[PDB]
Design an enzyme around this catalytic site. Structure first.
Site, PDB file in Angstrom:
ATOM      1  N   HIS A 288       0.854  -1.190   0.000  1.00 19.16           N
ATOM      2  CA  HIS A 288       0.000   0.000   0.000  1.00 19.16           C
ATOM      3  C   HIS A 288       0.881   1.228   0.000  1.00 19.16           C
ATOM      4  CE1 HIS A 288      -3.400   2.572   1.837  1.00 19.16           C
ATOM      5  NE2 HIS A 288      -2.356   3.287   2.228  1.00 19.16           N
ATOM      6  N   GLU A 289       1.806   1.288   0.980  1.00 16.16           N
ATOM      7  CA  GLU A 289       2.538   2.578   1.036  1.00 16.16           C
ATOM      8  C   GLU A 289       3.527   2.701  -0.120  1.00 16.16           C
ATOM      9  OE1 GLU A 289       2.162   5.352   3.277  1.00 16.16           O
ATOM     10  OE2 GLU A 289       0.200   4.436   3.639  1.00 16.16           O
TER      11      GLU A 289
ATOM     12  N   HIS B 202       1.904   4.411  -2.886  1.00 16.05           N
ATOM     13  CA  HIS B 202       1.813   5.869  -2.882  1.00 16.05           C
ATOM     14  C   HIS B 202       2.983   6.456  -3.703  1.00 16.05           C
ATOM     15  CE1 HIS B 202      -1.559   6.457  -0.219  1.00 16.05           C
ATOM     16  NE2 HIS B 202      -0.975   5.907   0.819  1.00 16.05           N
TER      17      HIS B 202
ATOM     18  N   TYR C  72      -3.590  14.761  -2.050  1.00 14.07           N
ATOM     19  CA  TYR C  72      -4.039  13.959  -0.902  1.00 14.07           C
ATOM     20  C   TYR C  72      -5.058  14.694  -0.049  1.00 14.07           C
ATOM     21  CZ  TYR C  72      -3.519  10.182   2.418  1.00 14.07           C
ATOM     22  OH  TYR C  72      -3.744   9.067   3.198  1.00 14.07           O
TER      23      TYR C  72
ATOM     24  N   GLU D  73      -5.783   6.864  -1.768  1.00 11.99           N
ATOM     25  CA  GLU D  73      -5.832   5.809  -0.753  1.00 11.99           C
ATOM     26  C   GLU D  73      -6.344   4.500  -1.321  1.00 11.99           C
ATOM     27  OE1 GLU D  73      -5.348   5.011   2.599  1.00 11.99           O
ATOM     28  OE2 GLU D  73      -3.776   6.519   2.382  1.00 11.99           O
TER      29      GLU D  73
ATOM     30  N   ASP E 164      -9.306  14.178   8.647  1.00 10.38           N
ATOM     31  CA  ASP E 164      -8.616  13.184   7.821  1.00 10.38           C
ATOM     32  C   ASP E 164      -8.448  13.672   6.392  1.00 10.38           C
ATOM     33  OD1 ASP E 164      -7.476  10.654   7.001  1.00 10.38           O
ATOM     34  OD2 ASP E 164      -9.477   9.873   6.644  1.00 10.38           O
TER      35      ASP E 164
ATOM     36  N   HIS F 142      -9.266   8.321   4.140  1.00  7.25           N
ATOM     37  CA  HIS F 142      -9.222   6.941   4.576  1.00  7.25           C
ATOM     38  C   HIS F 142     -10.634   6.389   4.854  1.00  7.25           C
ATOM     39  CE1 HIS F 142      -5.148   8.332   5.896  1.00  7.25           C
ATOM     40  NE2 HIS F 142      -4.766   7.111   5.520  1.00  7.25           N
TER      41      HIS F 142
END
Ligand code: CA
Ligand code: CA
Ligand code: CA
Ligand code: CA
Ligand code: RU
EC number: 3.4.24.27
Length: 316
Positions: free
Chosen positions: A142-143, A146, A157, A166, A226, A231
């Site tokens: 996932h990261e 990015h 973002y 996300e 957020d 998210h």
């Protein structure tokens, strides 16, 4: 560092033994020279100065508890590298074999992992909400995804482009999890979240609502927390993606699933050829439809399923 390529052995966070690519020069370093311009793993030593020190080990064996997060950050970065290269013909996150750098033991009891614009950073968790987060292949991929997005679509973002950013990371983190094929699922973070509770996770793509995330545009979050719910509203797109792959009927709308591989091709092509920094959900629908049109033809089942899926989550 300059040295000779070697192969070390160790145990990751979940107690599994794996081999890792290392580099020998006095010490054995977590430096994998076999992938692109290198995969490099660092020790942040419980502090927040980054990247910290390139991981050095005297004997090329990585079985200490302190070594486990490093073993998995290093190995699952390689799995992620392999996925993008073998499945999408992409060489590292910039498409030109950029070195992949990761730091572990970031801060103390830090319940998160993140790409900081230059590298991956992994907390150890507090032992209650999380165990060391590089133990989750979907979290690692996932990261790292990015970084792919920042070099391609560039989705800002916040708000809907942020929720797409996300979801793109949840989507490819999950597809990397299936690629590695070890207990794969459509949940996020389950291998490292709440070791005292079984069956849960951070988020669910197949039913976001299990954790209070929206599964339809009419339930989107429109407040400012957020970064405008990136998210949270990611659940709307995660559900769409899940439906495209797996099919199902959602608020009465039926989707014919086309499988993971095609989900991955469609969304990879959308991410790299059509999405832009300010893309909203309706623009993602168009990008996905066009990608499926390119790959499979305007009259394909693939295009029709993509449309069904976005209709099912209320995105036109
Ligand atoms: Ca050792
Ligand atoms: Ca899993
Ligand atoms: Ca998972
Ligand atoms: Ca748990
Ligand atoms: Ru993220």
């Amino acid at each position: 560092i300059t040295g000779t390529s070697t192969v070390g052995v160790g145990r990751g966070v979940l107690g599994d033994q794996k081999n890792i690519n290392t580099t020998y020069s006095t010490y054995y370093y977590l430096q994998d020279n076999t992938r692109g311009n290198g995969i490099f793993t660092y020790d942040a030593k419980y502090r927040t100065t980054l990247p910290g020190s390139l991981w050095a080990d005297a004997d090329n064996q990585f079985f200490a508890s302190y070594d486990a997060p490093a073993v998995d950050a290093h190995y699952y970065a390689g799995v992620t590298y392999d996925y993008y290269k073998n499945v999408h013909n992409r060489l590292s996150y910039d498409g030109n074999n950029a070195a992949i750098r990761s730091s572990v033991h970031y801060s103390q009891g830090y319940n998160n992992a993140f790409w900081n614009g230059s590298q991956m950073v992994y907390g150890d968790g507090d032992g209650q909400t999380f165990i060391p987060l590089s133990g989750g292949i979907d979290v690692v991929a996932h990261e790292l995804t990015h970084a792919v997005t920042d070099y391609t679509a560039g989705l800002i973002y916040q708000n809907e482009s942020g929720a797409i950013n996300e979801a793109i990371s949840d989507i490819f983190g999950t597809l990397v999890e299936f690629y590695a094929n070890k207990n794969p699922d459509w949940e996020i973070g389950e291998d490292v979240y709440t070791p005292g509770i079984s069956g849960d996770s951070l988020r669910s793509m197949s039913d976001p609502a299990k954790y209070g995330d929206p599964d339809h545009y009419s339930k989107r979050y429109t407040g400012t927390q957020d970064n405008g719910g990136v998210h949270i509203n990611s659940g709307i797109i995660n559900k769409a993606a899940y439906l495209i792959s797996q099919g199902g009927t959602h608020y009465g709308v039926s989707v014919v699933g086309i499988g993971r591989d095609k989900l991955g091709k469609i969304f990879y092509r959308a991410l790299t050829q059509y999405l832009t920094p300010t893309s909203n959900f309706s623009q993602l629908r168009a990008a996905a439809v066009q990608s499926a049109t390119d790959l499979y033809g305007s009259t394909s089942q693939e295009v029709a399923s993509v449309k069904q899926a976005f209709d099912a989550v209320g995105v036109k």
